Amino acid sequence: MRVGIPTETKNNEFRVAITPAGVAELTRRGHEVLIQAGAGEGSAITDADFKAAGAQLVGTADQVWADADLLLKVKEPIAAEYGRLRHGQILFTFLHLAASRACTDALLDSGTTSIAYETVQTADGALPLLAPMSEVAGRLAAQVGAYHLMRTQGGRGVLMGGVPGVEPADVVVIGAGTAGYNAARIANGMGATVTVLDINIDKLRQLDAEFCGRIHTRYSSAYELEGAVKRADLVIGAVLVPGAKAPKLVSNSLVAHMKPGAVLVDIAIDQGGCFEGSRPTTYDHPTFAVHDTLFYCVANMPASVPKTSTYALTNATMPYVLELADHGWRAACRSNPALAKGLSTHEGALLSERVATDLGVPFTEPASVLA
Amino acid sequence: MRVGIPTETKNNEFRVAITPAGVAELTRRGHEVLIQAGAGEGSAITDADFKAAGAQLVGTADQVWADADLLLKVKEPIAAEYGRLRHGQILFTFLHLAASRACTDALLDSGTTSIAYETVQTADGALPLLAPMSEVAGRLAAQVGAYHLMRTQGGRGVLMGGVPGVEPADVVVIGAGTAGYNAARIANGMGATVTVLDINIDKLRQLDAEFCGRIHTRYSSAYELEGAVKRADLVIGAVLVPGAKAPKLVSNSLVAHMKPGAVLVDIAIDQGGCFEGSRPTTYDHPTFAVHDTLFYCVANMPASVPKTSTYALTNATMPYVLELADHGWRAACRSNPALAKGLSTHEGALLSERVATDLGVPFTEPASVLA
Amino acid sequence: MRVGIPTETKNNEFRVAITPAGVAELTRRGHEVLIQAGAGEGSAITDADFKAAGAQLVGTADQVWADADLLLKVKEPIAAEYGRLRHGQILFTFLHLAASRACTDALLDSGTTSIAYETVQTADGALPLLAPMSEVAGRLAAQVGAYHLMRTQGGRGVLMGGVPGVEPADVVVIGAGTAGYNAARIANGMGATVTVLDINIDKLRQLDAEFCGRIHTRYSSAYELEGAVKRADLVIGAVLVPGAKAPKLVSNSLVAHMKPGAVLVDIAIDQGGCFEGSRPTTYDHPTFAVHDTLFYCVANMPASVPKTSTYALTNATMPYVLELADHGWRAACRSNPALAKGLSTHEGALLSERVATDLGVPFTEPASVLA
């Protein structure tokens, strides 16, 4: 089939959904690979690199979208792309539909078949395509939080690790999953005192063992959470219920009681944000004031480190890309339950129960479109 | 005597040279403490906090300077302050004279008595007043280097620590002293691959043992230095010869051979810079381009984390401040050889041999003005 | 000469001042070794073990004391032993004279020559005979503090290390020297959050590097000390000025503000105690109440682990014992400045300036009795 990769268009989005190695393997398998001129430049993959791997370089986005049987992207379609969505095409990308009625409607109205990276899910419950991006975003949260704690950025003016004889920053991570663990690990490595909260005690045990208690763990009761947040210099929101809109765990009322110049990084912004005061920001304007604190709410954090994140992502997605190209969506999803869990839309039907619930929109069973 | 502390005026300088506790101890000893209204605000020390500790709050900088027998500052006098320097007054602050003929001339022409924090030196050869700032600056270099490696900042677009299956950043630290050790430690904590060079093998042996080889050490031969720099995503320049202009270790020719978007942080900029291409930048405009790389050359790095660095600095300086106030410069320096090594100017005479050599200016023996 | 070792008589004192190996080395050098029957039993060294090494086992303490030219002990003479002190005899033991006018007077009135283990001091300033006992006492403070934190012991009822999801104990160590470092290390190993204070920043810098920030370090300002103590579940007092009465750093007023059931272990009790409320306790009755807290003030902590501490002590003391036996006190002290610093009394003259100052008693120069 024809596999198309357009240039990402979200603000400062430097990632691309395929590398030369993936192009070469698709072509080895009898597929036609179409790629918009310039699509890999953010990730230092020249048109010439893609050409040598076997891609057809096309001048415009409209052609990639029109010609592709399988359209591969990194981020969700944005408003200017809603018109490019079409019936009879497979879209494979991060979707975050529980967080956007407008995006969901556009997919449904177009009749396109869409599969979300972030709801592809193996039998152990893991999300193998979200995981590498959660790892990137977690590590970035720590480095971005430390930078914004500087007085010159409007922060409290506290050094992450302190220096001998002087207290370090107090960092609170909400969620001990992939992003939270990665945020905690880097923040701890920068010398901050790190506390991680979760409602899953198993995850806290795992963190306790891995750092031998150097990273503090607190069960996420209302009392522990509020107490930790009030004391924090930096809060990193990293909770998830797979495919769902993030729960609102930190109220604006709580934020009003925080130390002046504290920083809050809402990693969960891609699913709507786990802070009440969150709204999406971009790399051009990443922060805004809430009460006397600074919120950071970038829904495409890994975009700033494309040399790392393009590869991390495609190492994970490629086996799934190959099965979709070889067999088409129905046969691929039929053969792979994990893949099938990423199914989101098809011919105006919404195939995710959690998305349908969060948006208040009718749900149709995926088994129905697969049988 | 009268101990005066004016507001710092260098760009984005949020530190202050004393805290309420130091003010209280000075007043307990019969000293008059004069402080410019607003001087502690960058460090979250209000005029009211200084007042309660015993300070006289004065409206203008000119008064502090005119009235103080001992003038305490954080950074060197800048141009607009040259007219405030006076004969009969002791100035105790960071000076960096080997890096500024203009500052040195101003001190000499004023006839003031000046002692440099950074050349106060104990008999083991350590610089106890520079050390905590070198600790701050080293830790900041890692976090600031990581941030500027982001594509959105003009950098290469590589995450410090990578993620599983994908390479981390390659970090090179030149100098294994206080600043370099701290930069290496934080960069390593962020998951970067860190290589540290020095000409002092003892210092490399210490780093090797502390991290049991996780931080790489290379003797600083031309071959090792050039090779490490060409491979680096981030270079941190942290060399020092006490009180001297920094040696130029990284040529612009070498920089032309580096990877595009690499970042170079010149911590040694306060002493003139150890990179050939270095020139001082400010927190307002911290970076500039050299060839295809980004240089970061801020001479007052600890200013951005004043809640940490004001205290770190004053924990160290205060015992020296108390000796100078109790006994005056001559008797304090007679009693304390370490203090006496900080002696820089007195009545138009330049008292540092290393500074005199570097600037091409007459040297006068400090034992002569202490006899 | 005759080297005598009596049985220790302080409460629960299970240590002994020599082992079979030391006895054998003394006898190899032509010395007569006299040991009280039963002296080694606390340390599991039977009379038969000492006999086989060459010792003369004697039935009574009075004989050991009467016959010995060099008398080796572990702890200071107590009241019932004051009548055994004699002119012409060398006493070599822990003395702690700055803490006991009564002990000092007894030594002075007897005219005996005494050398204190704890003031023997090498040119680097280290106290090589105190050090291994400080190591023992520091490690014990952590384990004894943890035990007394149990509700069943009157303490707050908090587990040292917490468990995943639940806060650990907050431990504050005052003094970053041998005892404090060892207390911090063990407390941290038990999973407590440990903060260590000192006025010597060099020592904090060393702790910071050794644990890469896992043990918190705070410069010991009034503000940091008071704040840390109010938050603490367990406080360990481990400060020292060599040969001096301990400074009083924790007021009873501060103790009144602590959490109910907090535990305070005063390791510095042997030198008078660094807590205002401290008074010496014994292993039989180790604790007492101050306000709503529990104080632990045992002046012979290493006695409880004699299998460890007898050997640790004698590994260190023996080379000094051999010098004193071979050459006598005057020539040994003439040859070894470190040994000479332990000189405490001789023929009614007090030879330590620090002790003399603390007790308000005339000082006589040790160079005078060595000339």
Place this chain on the structure above:
Amino acid sequence: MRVGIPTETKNNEFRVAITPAGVAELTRRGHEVLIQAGAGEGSAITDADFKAAGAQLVGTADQVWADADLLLKVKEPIAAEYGRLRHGQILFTFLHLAASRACTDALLDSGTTSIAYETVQTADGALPLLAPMSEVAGRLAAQVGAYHLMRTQGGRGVLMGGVPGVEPADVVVIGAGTAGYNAARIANGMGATVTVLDINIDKLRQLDAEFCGRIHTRYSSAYELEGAVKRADLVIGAVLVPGAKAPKLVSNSLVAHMKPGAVLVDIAIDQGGCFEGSRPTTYDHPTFAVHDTLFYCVANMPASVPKTSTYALTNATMPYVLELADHGWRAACRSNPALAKGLSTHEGALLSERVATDLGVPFTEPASVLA
């Protein structure tokens, strides 16, 4: 329904089965919470704290027991409570029935419905309600073992971690599960040389990886076990077969060959003890002599650290408490197989096969009382 929490009555039992937060959530759900006056005081939860959360404070235990539909406790009913057990009430607490015919009979004769915390078991085989108490007891075993190794407690007189140049204690842990891992981790953190035995090699691999071999692992053959025990200063028994009486792994004959003053802590005492010589002790009298060793056999170890263990326990139990209150035992157990595995008695029927086998008492299938 009515949820009742009486004061614990076992010796020195300071835990309570609910906290204010749990009370508040039960009341939010339409349940009536009854709590005996004083029940939370051991855990520093005042009657006023429980009152503010919504509980009815009742004067006597008899009323709590009579009125409660769901009775929540920490420990098993003791003799003086056997008369309070009633038909038509759900009891949810630690039971340890395989270790007490008398307790089992009382439950059976009363006709009450009982569910054991310690046999609630998820599909991975884990025991999520036992786990936090195993974590507490393991960590306590190390600290309690170290204390009793002191000569002043009748132990060998060896310091847990030794000091430089002198050997540390030799610690042997039997069982590499939750309690054993926690005991090993703390003992290692105190500087002891730790060896852990198990028949499950997977658990030994996990320990080997987590400490990179610093904690020794030995397959639990008769040879390795006997050899390790004879060499040990401290033995910690931490084996379990879920719901079963502990196997007797250390014979009195073996104990006769141990070093004099060795300490044995039998954590498995709650299930009957894994040492042949074990019998339950209390916090009032925790130890007794076997041959020349000291046995410690406290069946309610976490009771001494209630500020830690009350919260650890209730963080785990609460989701199960809520389901029992909302739906009653039959529907809750029907919906939750893990919960259903804790089913122990109902109307005179014993529902645990392992308990019935160990006691030699008839077994009835749980599916029979659930269908």
